[PDB]
Design an enzyme around this catalytic site. Sequence first.
Site, short mmCIF file in Angstrom:
data_model
loop_
_atom_site.label_atom_id
_atom_site.label_comp_id
_atom_site.label_asym_id
_atom_site.label_seq_id
_atom_site.Cartn_x
_atom_site.Cartn_y
_atom_site.Cartn_z
N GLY A 1 12.90 -19.04 3.95
CA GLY A 1 13.54 -18.89 5.24
C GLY A 1 12.50 -18.31 6.18
O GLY A 1 12.75 -18.12 7.38
N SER B 1 10.10 -28.74 -2.64
CA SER B 1 10.73 -29.80 -1.87
C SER B 1 10.35 -29.83 -0.39
O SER B 1 10.21 -28.79 0.24
CB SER B 1 12.25 -29.71 -2.01
OG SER B 1 12.72 -28.46 -1.54
N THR C 1 14.89 -28.29 7.12
CA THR C 1 15.19 -27.53 8.33
C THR C 1 14.04 -26.61 8.72
O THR C 1 14.16 -25.82 9.67
CB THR C 1 16.45 -26.66 8.15
N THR D 1 6.34 -26.78 1.04
CA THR D 1 5.19 -26.64 0.18
C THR D 1 4.79 -28.05 -0.17
O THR D 1 3.61 -28.37 -0.24
CB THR D 1 5.52 -25.87 -1.10
N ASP E 1 26.44 -21.36 2.89
CA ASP E 1 25.73 -21.35 1.63
C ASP E 1 26.40 -20.38 0.68
O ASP E 1 26.14 -19.19 0.74
CB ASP E 1 24.26 -20.96 1.83
CG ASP E 1 23.37 -21.38 0.68
OD1 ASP E 1 23.89 -21.68 -0.41
OD2 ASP E 1 22.14 -21.41 0.86
N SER F 1 22.21 -23.67 -7.91
CA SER F 1 21.31 -24.70 -7.45
C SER F 1 19.86 -24.35 -7.65
O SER F 1 19.08 -25.19 -8.08
CB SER F 1 21.55 -24.98 -5.98
OG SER F 1 20.41 -25.61 -5.44
N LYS G 1 16.92 -15.94 5.62
CA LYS G 1 18.16 -16.19 4.88
C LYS G 1 18.87 -14.88 4.54
O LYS G 1 20.00 -14.65 4.98
CB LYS G 1 17.86 -16.98 3.60
#
Lengths: 493, 493
Positions: free
Chosen positions: B168, B194, B198, B203, B256, B264, B288
């Site tokens: 975040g 991944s 947003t 990475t 979330d 997850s 976050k």
Amino acid sequence: MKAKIRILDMFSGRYTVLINEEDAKEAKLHPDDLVKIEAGKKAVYGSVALSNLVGKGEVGISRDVLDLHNFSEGETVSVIPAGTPESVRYIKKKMHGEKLRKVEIEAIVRDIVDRKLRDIEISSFVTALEINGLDMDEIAALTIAMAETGDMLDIDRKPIMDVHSIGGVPGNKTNILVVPIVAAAGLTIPKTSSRAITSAAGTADVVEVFADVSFSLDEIKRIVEKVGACLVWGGALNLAPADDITIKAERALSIDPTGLMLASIMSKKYAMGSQYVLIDIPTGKGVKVETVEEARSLARDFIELGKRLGQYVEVAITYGGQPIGHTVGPALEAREALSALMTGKGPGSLIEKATGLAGILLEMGGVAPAGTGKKMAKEILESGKAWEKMKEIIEAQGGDPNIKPEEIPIGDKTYTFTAATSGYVTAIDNRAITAIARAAGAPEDKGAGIELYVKVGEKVKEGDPLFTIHAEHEARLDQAIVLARRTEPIRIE
Amino acid sequence: MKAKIRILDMFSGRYTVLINEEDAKEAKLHPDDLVKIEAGKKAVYGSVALSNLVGKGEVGISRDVLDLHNFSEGETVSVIPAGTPESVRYIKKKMHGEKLRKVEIEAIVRDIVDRKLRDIEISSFVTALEINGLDMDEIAALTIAMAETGDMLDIDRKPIMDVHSIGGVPGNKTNILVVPIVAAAGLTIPKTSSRAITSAAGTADVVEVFADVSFSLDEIKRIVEKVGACLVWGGALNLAPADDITIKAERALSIDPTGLMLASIMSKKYAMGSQYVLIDIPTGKGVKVETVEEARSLARDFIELGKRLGQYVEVAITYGGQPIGHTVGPALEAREALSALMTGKGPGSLIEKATGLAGILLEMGGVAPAGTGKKMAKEILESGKAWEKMKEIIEAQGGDPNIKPEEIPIGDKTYTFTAATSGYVTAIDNRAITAIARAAGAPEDKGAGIELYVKVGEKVKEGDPLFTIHAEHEARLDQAIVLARRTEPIRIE
């Protein structure tokens, strides 16, 4: 971005916009993304799909869009990406159990209608409502809002009456009987039923058999002005657009929140200006409302909702344990409803209720003295005065008034189930009966359905025939026979 | 209903199945209905869309389907209507607040993975979880269930070490540093990050800049066996398929669930056989996890879920108010991360954070005595052992180990913002900073990004440059500039 509109010969159940992969890359658009397409004052919200079928500079819009918005092919439109809707925040507050300001509710509904809020937002909103709920202030705001966002019909005749059935009961073709009966009294009663999705038949499905269901709002008004009543299908007109979209969500999750339902039912009535509404709550096992106590509460909710909306409302709690009449399926139901109107003699279950429900309406209208409503309805039916009104409705609807009920065609292939043992019939299961009828092909095939020669409390002897299955296609009949065999819908003891 | 499969050049972002209007009527299929398409062993679930595109006797499947299913054009396939999944019953229970049995949890995941549960059902499960929450027993069950239904890689080297930052925070190129350093110690650490959804960069995006990121599981195992580490994209392999499907709903709803997030994040690790996972929770304004108290609570949960999964988990709460290093964007981030590895020297935020995280892993790996990990990490980085190791990863990933960081391309068009007044820098907004970087075109354009010449608490006289905007197109940069001017990401007082 500006691109020329290109019509797509496809129905996706959503507003689908097709964009070029290269063109899409320029806008940073991704699949399933929401984009706003606009030209002049009018604009529409669509869900992006990327295909190379459409060339650079062209936007592909499915036919779903054409129904509510007029876009001409080869037209130049500006396609811009859409930000997450403001209303989502409001969905969240409800999610958190917070009450909703009327303003917050309105925004949510408008977005639902404009399509900014899609399946995910709506399922969440519906889910939130079920878990958290809506208090009465919220329901009314929601009810008025749902009606406001959609087209409303204004009719000169007053008082205007409406009749509704929450449903869940098979073969409830009673409304067909009630409207003709009430109109004869000269009261105005414009009914707008909807075609069946989870049921063997719908009032609309039954009506299509002897008349044409679809009509414009204006056309609907004209018919009501002369006929005094109409039996048209609800789906074609733009009423409570929000209510139908939410329903897709409700059907899938198999949950029906009471606030949404009360609001949804009243939204349509308010839009058409019905002043007196009768709601029928079929209570019983295998019906949406299982007990009298639940029904009693629901009736109170409906009546109060009416006060907020300015509608005088009354509710009737009726038995939903067994299917109404001996006919299930649209073709079969139409014959039964029509023969009863013409003959004036029909199944007791169908006949008593229609007259009784109709009677409540007559008293509300002011046409009949209190306590004589049921009786006045009986005289109209017997007189055949009711049948003539139906003929007028049929003629207006484009149906053949000179049609004969015996003449209507039931399914060619039929199998009949007989009692396994001697006994008394303790119960009939609605879900199984409807399920079997649906397997038989209803309502896609008008011919298919089920005919019951027995009613609950009825004595039976071995070999007596409980019900017969009518199917248009033999392949369909086996499936129906098989489902029927496992279910053993009729119970004898 | 037998049919010959036809592949349509279109990406719907869903398994779209096109059917003829004539063919559909016979099958009672409607738009957006769920249908099961099967050949031999292969079967897939798709949403029906009525189209003209496909001729009678044919069914059209979009390219999305091709990804996980080997369906050849002209292939003969059978199409049947899918019924509502049994799992929805379970979703309802969670809806009613009931704890979920493992079999029930397992069922939902398999259905989610199989695509039986579409957008409406998933949103409800997700909405319900946020509204009702997930018990700790359920989370482990959910986490394992998610891991079980996807490809899992069993790597021979043990112990397996993993590092993950809930992130975040802008410009977090730290993991790139951590993996090589840890790898040098001879520990095994296979990272699969991944691409940004947003964020300004991911990475994965940064790694692609100097090396191919898309790799097979089999391809992936081999590199680790020899390289001992890897920096590859998560998306290419089928790991924890459910996480992504569910994730879209959460992003759409901007929510979330804590239980869902842990499952997850943890699901991927379980699948890869990680045995020692280190979690980095960036706590701070505009991150976050905003508060340390919140972050600490999150940390307890990650560790407990670890025990349940048989993994030694350790969390490190770090600061995330200001962007890490001085670079945002993939081209910019890669140069900075790479330069530090080669030089052994770089910005303090990146090097200290990177070494510390790496040290905990080293201590965890047994490679270092307790309390000596950060010092050892610095020696490896300082030694240049780390940079050597990066080249092995870069090489195996298919890039030039001989690349000169300084060489890597940056956007041609740039603008610089200077200090409006004199004073000390009191704060930087990542959301604002990231927003500007995105406007510039990150991460689609590697060249696009932002460069900060300041850190919080620095004292700058009026006219000092604060940050520089890099864009690959003049149109994008100007939009960003307006955003940057509107934003005022740097506060001085």
